[PDB]
Structure 1
Amino acid sequence: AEYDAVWSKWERDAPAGESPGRAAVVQEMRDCLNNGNPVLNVGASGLTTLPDRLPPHITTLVIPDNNLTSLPELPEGLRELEVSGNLQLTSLPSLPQGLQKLWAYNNWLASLPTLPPGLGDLAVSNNQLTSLPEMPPALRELRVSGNNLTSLPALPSGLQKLWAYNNRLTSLPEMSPGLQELDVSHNQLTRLPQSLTGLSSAARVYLDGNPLSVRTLQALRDIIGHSGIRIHFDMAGPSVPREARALHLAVADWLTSAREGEAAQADRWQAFGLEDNAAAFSLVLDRLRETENFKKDAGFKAQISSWLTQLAEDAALRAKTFAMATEATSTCEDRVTHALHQMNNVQLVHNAEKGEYDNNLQGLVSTGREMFRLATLEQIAREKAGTLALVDDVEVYLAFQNKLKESLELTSVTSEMRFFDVSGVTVSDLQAAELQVKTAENSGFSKWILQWGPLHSVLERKVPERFNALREKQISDYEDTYRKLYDEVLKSSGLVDDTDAERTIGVSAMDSAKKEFLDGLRALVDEVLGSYLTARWRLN
């Protein structure tokens, strides 16, 4: 019929040397069209062009070792597509809904079409893939090894085996409970999800070749020794310390927006990368960026990216921020959350110094409470971090912010993810953290705000005369107390001649002044912002 005419010109248009192979395929296609052959296997004829039309009935198509650059629109009846050896094939056509097996290996695919809901076997290994489409519910085998993937999409519950060898994965999604084999060997994974512990006792997990953190390695040893799960990883391999990237490279991966000045700002960070402690700051950016939170919520980028802008304009702030990052890198991890908060505080202190809160004392308290809530969540995050073998402080803390943003009025949190579940953190944990945060805020926010850094900056700007009076009084109270205590030792005929005794008396005198100063600041805070320090949450 009409299909025969299309095949005729395809063979006739074949370049020299291809017509013999092209003609041979036509006979197989004609065989399918006449006697309804369900399988069409194009021979390894080196054909570079495929006919625009093919037998619609065929449910199986195989195209091995051909110099193809594109594929014709597939028939709806296909359930098995196998394309291999087409090193010039960089994309596949629209996948039919009824397709069940998709084998595209030893190709140069850079993108993958929308996966049909019925696909169960996907093999796209040895390709140029950088991102995977959403996995079909019926998928049970996923061959994605030998690609440039950095993230894995949501894994269906029915997935049985997954191979991701020699990829660039930096974070792993929560794993399916019924996963027999999981090969993420030789990737850029620094930590693993807690769902790994939920696999079957006989499951084979291959994690060798990844820059797994020392804490993660210790967790795997305990996991294998207590649950009997077959986990293969590097134990006797030397522990590799993290190598910091150039600061501008790390910042560039955050400033990915199309704003006018984002790209130009990133280039400035080349010079900043030579500043002291830049390596520690670079590591912090990569630690936060290589997370499922970053991969799933663009709001995470909007927060860190805007924060970098202020650091680019304030040298003093940027240097102090870098010094904060040294804490996270001094130990291998688990100090990142504390460093991040101290980076926000220094940022707020400079914002207070700039005078943002000079006429927004109500906003200052609101920011203070929010920082107190975030500070409390840090401690709660650490507590759950120890309980969870494969989860650290950062991942737990991010989950608390995302779920408790509305519960605790955390306006600072730009991430709004409700379907993002971090295994190991149950609803009972969130409610306890939500209750504990509210309990602490009502009980001791007034004490907390006294030592808050931004409050001192704002007080120095809007109540300087009274603020400096307290500071001057502390000097006078210390001097008077020192002379008072100095004489008391003299009456006891104690040691006052030696310098150390004078120093020890000074600390006693200095402590007394600090107690006097703290009480004075408490009264001043109540006078200025006392009305804003009332209990926020109605509790039981």
Structure 2
Amino acid sequence: EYDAVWSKWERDAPAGESPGRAAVVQEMRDCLNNGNPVLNVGASGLTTLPDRLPPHITTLVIPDNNLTSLPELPEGLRELEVSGNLQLTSLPSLPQGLQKLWAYNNWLASLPTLPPGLGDLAVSNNQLTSLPEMPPALRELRVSGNNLTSLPALPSGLQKLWAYNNRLTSLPEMSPGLQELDVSHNQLTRLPQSLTGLSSAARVYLDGNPLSVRTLQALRDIIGHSGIRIHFDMAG
């Protein structure tokens, strides 16, 4: 059942990938035998992955490799980290129970439909020009270093948003309990007046934006009245 899929994967290996693919198969067998819910394939120029992965894993870690696609994901996965795969333009359909998705530094041109219970979404340094609707339970969004123009409406539960180094020409309405917003180096000029909801403890970062004279003066007003920490470029 599993031996067959993994055998064909190991045999189809180019020289150079033989030790790497062996180490992974050994790890996957270990996972079945002892019940380890975590699978980390390591960095070894992997060009492909097996068709089936152990069914019970909850965490899958894919370090720097040369993948162009990912196989069907474990039906009960809760954490996925993929980084450093520059031929990887898209992701497989995400399992419903996924909680954490770190897909930094690949070449994603889009993102699949996001699982209901997703809490942490970090997809910085990709190729994304837009993003899908956000699930209600989200508490962290990191989408920096992409050519995003706008952002979807944010779930109210959101605690942190990083979207710096994009092409943002506006912001959506803010969640009420936001603690940290970094949108440094975008094309923002008008603040969503929605921002005013941020608490005294909250930290905002607006450096490297044009900002309309009125909006600058309005921010200068907020600091004096709210004691809030807001950073932005200023002449003088």
- Under TM normalisation by the shorter chain, which class is it? over 0.9
Distance 1:22 1:39 in 2: 17
- How much does 1:163 deviate? 0.3
**1:463-518 deviation line (CA, Å, top 9, x unaligned):** xxxxxxxxxxxxxxxxxxxxxxxxxxxxxxxxxxxxxxxxxxxxxxxxxxxxxxxx
- The DSSP-based 3-state class of the residue aligned with 2:103 is strand
Distance 1:225 1:116 in 2: 41
What's 2:228 paired with? 229
Distance 2:37 2:221 in 1: 52
**1:46-82 deviation line (CA, Å, top 9, x unaligned):** 1011111111110000000111110001011100000
Distance 2:93 2:12 in 1: 25
What's 1:131 paired with? 130
What's 1:150 paired with? 149
Distance 1:234 1:224 in 2: 14
**1:100-143 deviation line (CA, Å, top 9, x unaligned):** 00000011111101110100000000111111111111110111
Distance 1:44 1:115 in 2: 27
- The DSSP-based 3-state class of the residue aligned with 1:159 is coil
- The DSSP-based 3-state class of the residue aligned with 2:69 is coil
- The DSSP-based 3-state class of the residue aligned with 1:212 is coil
- The DSSP-based 3-state class of the residue aligned with 1:61 is strand
- 1:86–1:106 contact (8 Å) kept in structure 2: yes
- How much does 1:162 deviate? 0.3
Distance 1:3 1:41 in 2: 18
Distance 1:49 1:124 in 2: 21
In our comparison, the structure showing a higher alpha carbon Rg is 1
- How much does 1:214 deviate? 1.1
Tell me, which stretches of 5 or more residues in structure 2 are unaligned?
Answer: none
Distance 1:155 1:180 in 2: 14
Distance 2:2 2:87 in 1: 26
> Pairwise mapping of residues 279-318 of structure 1 onto structure 2 (< 5 A)?
none
What's 1:160 paired with? 159
**1:225-265 deviation line (CA, Å, top 9, x unaligned):** 11111100011xxxxxxxxxxxxxxxxxxxxxxxxxxxxxx
> Pairwise mapping of residues 515-526 of structure 1 onto structure 2 (< 5 A)?
none
Distance 1:212 1:109 in 2: 30
What's 1:314 paired with? none
> Pairwise mapping of residues 71-110 of structure 1 onto structure 2 (< 5 A)?
71-110=70-109
Task: Looking at secondary structure, tell me which structure has more helix per residue.
Answer: 1
**1:394-427 deviation line (CA, Å, top 9, x unaligned):** xxxxxxxxxxxxxxxxxxxxxxxxxxxxxxxxxx
- The DSSP-based 3-state class of the residue aligned with 1:105 is coil
- How much does 1:34 deviate? 2.1
- 1:39–1:58 contact (8 Å) kept in structure 2: yes
Distance 2:113 2:130 in 1: 12
- 1:11–1:23 contact (8 Å) kept in structure 2: yes
- 1:209–1:234 contact (8 Å) kept in structure 2: yes
**1:320-377 deviation line (CA, Å, top 9, x unaligned):** xxxxxxxxxxxxxxxxxxxxxxxxxxxxxxxxxxxxxxxxxxxxxxxxxxxxxxxxxx
Distance 1:129 1:34 in 2: 40
- 1:4–1:30 contact (8 Å) kept in structure 2: no
Q: Which TM-score applies when normalising by structure 2? A: 0.97
- How much does 1:188 deviate? 0.9
- 1:188–1:211 contact (8 Å) kept in structure 2: yes
Alignment RMSD? 3.6
- The DSSP-based 3-state class of the residue aligned with 1:34 is helix
Distance 2:93 2:32 in 1: 22
**1:245-300 deviation line (CA, Å, top 9, x unaligned):** xxxxxxxxxxxxxxxxxxxxxxxxxxxxxxxxxxxxxxxxxxxxxxxxxxxxxxxx
Distance 1:211 1:15 in 2: 51
Distance 2:129 2:18 in 1: 36
Distance 1:197 1:220 in 2: 10
Give the percent of matched residue pairs that are identical in Structure 1 and Structure 2.
100
- 1:39–1:61 contact (8 Å) kept in structure 2: yes
- 1:177–1:195 contact (8 Å) kept in structure 2: no
Task: Looking at secondary structure, tell me which structure has more strand per residue.
Answer: 2
Distance 1:227 1:22 in 2: 57
Q: Which TM-score applies when normalising by structure 1? A: 0.43
- How much does 1:195 deviate? 1.4
- How much does 1:147 deviate? 0.5
- The DSSP-based 3-state class of the residue aligned with 1:73 is coil
What's 1:459 paired with? none
